[PDB]
Amino acid sequence: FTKELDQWIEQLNECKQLSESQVKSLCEKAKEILTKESNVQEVRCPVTVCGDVHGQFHDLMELFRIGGKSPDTNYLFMGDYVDRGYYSVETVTLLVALKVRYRERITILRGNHESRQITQVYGFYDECLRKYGNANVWKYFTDLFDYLPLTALVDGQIFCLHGGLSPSIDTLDHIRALDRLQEVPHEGPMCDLLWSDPDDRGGWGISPRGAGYTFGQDISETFNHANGLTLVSRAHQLVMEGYNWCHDRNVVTIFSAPNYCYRCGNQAAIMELDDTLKYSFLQFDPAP
Amino acid sequence: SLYPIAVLIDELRNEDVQLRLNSIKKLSTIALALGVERTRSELLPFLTDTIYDEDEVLLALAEQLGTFTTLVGGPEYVHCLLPPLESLATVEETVVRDKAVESLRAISHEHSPSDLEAHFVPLVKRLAGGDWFTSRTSACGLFSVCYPRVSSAVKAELRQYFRNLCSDDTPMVRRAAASKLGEFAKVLELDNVKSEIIPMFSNLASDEQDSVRLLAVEACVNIAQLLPQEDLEALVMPTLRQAAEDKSWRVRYMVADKFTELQKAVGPEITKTDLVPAFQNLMKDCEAEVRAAASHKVKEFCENLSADCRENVIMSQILPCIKELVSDANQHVKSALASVIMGLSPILGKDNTIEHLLPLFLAQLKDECPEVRLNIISNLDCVNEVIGIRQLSQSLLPAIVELAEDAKWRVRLAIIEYMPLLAGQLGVEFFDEKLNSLCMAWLVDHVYAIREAATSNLKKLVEKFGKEWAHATIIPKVLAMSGDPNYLHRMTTLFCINVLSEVCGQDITTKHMLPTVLRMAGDPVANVRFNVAKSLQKIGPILDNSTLQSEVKPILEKLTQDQDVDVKYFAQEALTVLSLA
Numbered sequence A: 001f002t003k004e005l006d007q008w009i010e011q012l013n014e015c016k017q018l019s020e021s022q023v024k025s026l027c028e029k030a031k032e033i034l035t036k037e038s039n040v041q042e043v044r045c046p047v048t049v050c051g052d053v054h055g056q057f058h059d060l061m062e063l064f065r066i067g068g069k070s071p072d073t074n075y076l077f078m079g080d081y082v083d084r085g086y087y088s089v090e091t092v093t094l095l096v097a098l099k100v101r102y103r104e105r106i107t108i109l110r111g112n113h114e115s116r117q118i119t120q121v122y123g124f125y126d127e128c129l130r131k132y133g134n135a136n137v138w139k140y141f142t143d144l145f146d147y148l149p150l151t152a153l154v155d156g157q158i159f160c161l162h163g164g165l166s167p168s169i170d171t172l173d174h175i176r177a178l179d180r181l182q183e184v185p186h187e188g189p190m191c192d193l194l195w196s197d198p199d200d201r202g203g204w205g206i207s208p209r210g211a212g213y214t215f216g217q218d219i220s221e222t223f224n225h226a227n228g229l230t231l232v233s234r235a236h237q238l239v240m241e242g243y244n245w246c247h248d249r250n251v252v253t254i255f256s257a258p259n260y261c262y263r264c265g266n267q268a269a270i271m272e273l274d275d276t277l278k279y280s281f282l283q284f285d286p287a288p
Numbered sequence B: 001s002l003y004p005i006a007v008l009i010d011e012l013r014n015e016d017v018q019l020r021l022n023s024i025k026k027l028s029t030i031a032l033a034l035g036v037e038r039t040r041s042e043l044l045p046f047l048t049d050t051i052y053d054e055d056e057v058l059l060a061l062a063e064q065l066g067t068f069t070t071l072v073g074g075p076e077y078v079h080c081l082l083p084p085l086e087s088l089a090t091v092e093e094t095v096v097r098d099k100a101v102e103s104l105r106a107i108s109h110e111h112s113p114s115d116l117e118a119h120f121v122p123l124v125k126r127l128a129g130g131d132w133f134t135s136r137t138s139a140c141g142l143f144s145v146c147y148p149r150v151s152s153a154v155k156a157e158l159r160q161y162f163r164n165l166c167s168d169d170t171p172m173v174r175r176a177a178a179s180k181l182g183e184f185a186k187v188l189e190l191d192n193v194k195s196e197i198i199p200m201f202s203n204l205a206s207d208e209q210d211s212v213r214l215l216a217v218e219a220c221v222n223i224a225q226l227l228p229q230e231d232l233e234a235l236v237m238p239t240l241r242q243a244a245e246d247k248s249w250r251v252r253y254m255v256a257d258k259f260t261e262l263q264k265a266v267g268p269e270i271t272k273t274d275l276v277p278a279f280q281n282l283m284k285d286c287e288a289e290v291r292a293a294a295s296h297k298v299k300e301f302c303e304n305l306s307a308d309c310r311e312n313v314i315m316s317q318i319l320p321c322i323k324e325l326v327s328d329a330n331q332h333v334k335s336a337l338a339s340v341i342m343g344l345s346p347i348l349g350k351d352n353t354i355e356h357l358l359p360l361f362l363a364q365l366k367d368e369c370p371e372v373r374l375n376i377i378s379n380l381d382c383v384n385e386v387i388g389i390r391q392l393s394q395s396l397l398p399a400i401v402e403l404a405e406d407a408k409w410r411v412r413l414a415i416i417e418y419m420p421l422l423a424g425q426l427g428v429e430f431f432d433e434k435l436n437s438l439c440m441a442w443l444v445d446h447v448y449a450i451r452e453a454a455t456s457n458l459k460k461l462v463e464k465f466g467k468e469w470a471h472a473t474i475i476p477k478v479l480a481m482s483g484d485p486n487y488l489h490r491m492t493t494l495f496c497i498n499v500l501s502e503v504c505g506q507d508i509t510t511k512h513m514l515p516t517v518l519r520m521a522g523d524p525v526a527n528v529r530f531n532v533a534k535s536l537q538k539i540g541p542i543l544d545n546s547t548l549q550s551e552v553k554p555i556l557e558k559l560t561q562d563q564d565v566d567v568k569y570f571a572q573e574a575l576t577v578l579s580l581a
């Protein structure tokens, strides 16, 4: 079974999709592994933190060109593997296939898009249909996304999640408390963690997204201080420069899909955390 | 069919009297069985007509007949070989007609002067004045062999047919005649070159068909040599100047292609008078195919101007034209020039090169088309042996260093691939001083692909300078990274040891790399540890078996007990592959 996973990975690197057959297989094993993981997954450095990919397969390939090949380089993606991009199927499968072959070398979080309702509006649902003729591969994958860890704590100091903070979550324990094994709710803690955005207005505000909230600097500082965190690491938001600092460096945004939707013209970035939790950024443009 | 000839036949297939291929080549022997008399009376006639379209065969038969002179009775009977060769000359698939001619030309010399007139020329004519066209295309390569040895009267005759062949109603029969016009001109008396060849030439040069005209440029070279310097302006130059101006760029192309050759055929004075301006026009042609053909000739041409006017026409006539091309649109052209431009250095001096060429050298070394700067980089050898290596380093090093640390990696990757080139050209002492730094600096670049690039680059470098130079100049600094706190850098160290074992040899690998590899088996980060298993599986084969059993087998067995899943899996794999399991 190990020689097989290697094959599936070699294939997926040639942008060639796996068969409904194997995706069903890969997905159940990925479920077994992702179940034992915490809502606040422990991740030790060194490890490279990545943000949004959104099916932009060839950019994901350009990412590995810049941060090193798996499993020599350790990775942590903060979700949003599908939708918008033209290759949601190949992208998410390469990543899930990487997680099953190398549990300790890769960590995959859940983004607002690793859900069932949004994937039927932005791509992923229809793309599966154009490539497998039925909706099965989509069920195997959206079922799997229920098991994706909502967040990860790197070295007990750097807290990573897709979206951001919530008015109904003050401590890491509050998160470990939540039951994440379900579709993403329309309101609440689990929802906010995946939908909120840091803002430059104080306290809490109304998110223009229609879900989650906006949170100013004061909120982050409190959240950091109360949880002994040096930094909040998230994605979810387009950042032209590829990555962005805000809230007196309490928060950092990391976007890894260069030139989003093939129209934005933005750079992408990944954050390297070395053996000493020392950080460095790698900005990059879309691969030719 | 009957023996012994029947042996050639292939009684097994389903053909039309086809012959055994592996037998037509073993022909000089069937000719030995039946005697010389019978080789003529029965073997030759049988071959003559028996001509199926089995090409692999017709070829051999044509080739084989060119060495059958002696198996037929020696010279006095050499002509028996004509009938079958005449045939083979009119076939199809040119490959065969060529052979038939090469052989006809071969045995022409065996023919005696009298037998030449009695059987050869007659074959030439019937072939020339034959109906079908191939019978004529091939007929053109048989004039130059028989002309010299026959009589004045037959010579005349031969000249007439060669003309009729030039003025043939068919483009092909004319192209053929044109490309053999030079050869034929070379064996005629001067008068007839002037009175007979010149007119034939002029006519072909002004042919309705350009496919014919471009083939008169090659003839011009040949005719232009046989004539004395004074006669050239009157009987040739007008025609050649017209060709360089021809409506068909194809014809102009041929003039730029055969330039250096015309330059010799014509002589220095005319080259200075008529050729330098033409050359200038060609470099400014509207069609890029021509500008490039010409640009390619630059170095060779200037090299050939007469020693005295040389340096002056160059700085005055040629050089301004070159500055123009370095800016040309078509990369086809920029490309052509770039591959030869720095070859002008010797012909201009350390002073001129440094002031007028180094600028152009740079303008191209920073061109988009990577091929262009690569051509400049591939030919530094001469520019370097003309001006001082310090003078070149003073004009090259900054172009490099400026790119070796630039915006996007890719542009940086591109500069890593000029290294083995710069090395093998500029020499090992230069590399150890001004380049070894940039190669080690890349081993620790932020972009992975760049570190990867610079890693395999070492192997390419050790191939250039050797295993000694590697242990003294490269291994010391590569091993230094094992101490680095970043795991990305420590793994980079093992990666350099994998590639370097391939070319450093068993001794250096065991003595100076294996220890560093085994030492890291206890690195704090899992990724380095499992990559240590991989590195042992890699370099294990180069190490003699004793070492493999005493020092490697142990460390691996330990790693198989490591906490981490992957170090364990890779430790095992390593053992199973090295057979130490």
Ligand SMILES: C=C1[C@@H](O)[C@@H]2O[C@]3(CC[C@H](/C=C/[C@@H](C)[C@@H]4CC(C)=C[C@@]5(O[C@H](C[C@@](C)(O)C(=O)O)CC[C@H]5O)O4)O3)CC[C@H]2O[C@@H]1[C@@H](O)C[C@H](C)[C@@H]1CCC[C@@]2(OCCC[C@@H]2C)O1
Binding pocket: A083, A084, A117, A118, A122, A185, A186, A187, A208, A209, A210, A211, A238, A260, A261, A263, A264
């Ligand atoms: C997706 C989004 C939001 O995230 C998006 O948030 C806004 C603010 C910033 C964002 C735009 C960012 C740009 C950079 C991109 C750039 C480009 C080129 C395109 C574009 O792409 C957007 C969608 C997407 C993906 O690409 C994105 O989020 O960037 C849509 C707008 C479009 O201009 O903006 O827009 C306002 C409009 C919002 O709409 C939809 C929103 O109704 C979804 C809705 C709120 C969800 C849908 C699924 C079901 C459910 O789940 C949440 C709980 C309730 C319910 C179950 O309810």
Ligand SMILES: [Mn+2]
Binding pocket: A080, A111, A112, A113, A162, A235, A236, A237
């Ligand atoms: Mn998002």
Ligand SMILES: [Mn+2]
Binding pocket: A052, A054, A080, A236, A237
């Ligand atoms: Mn997103």
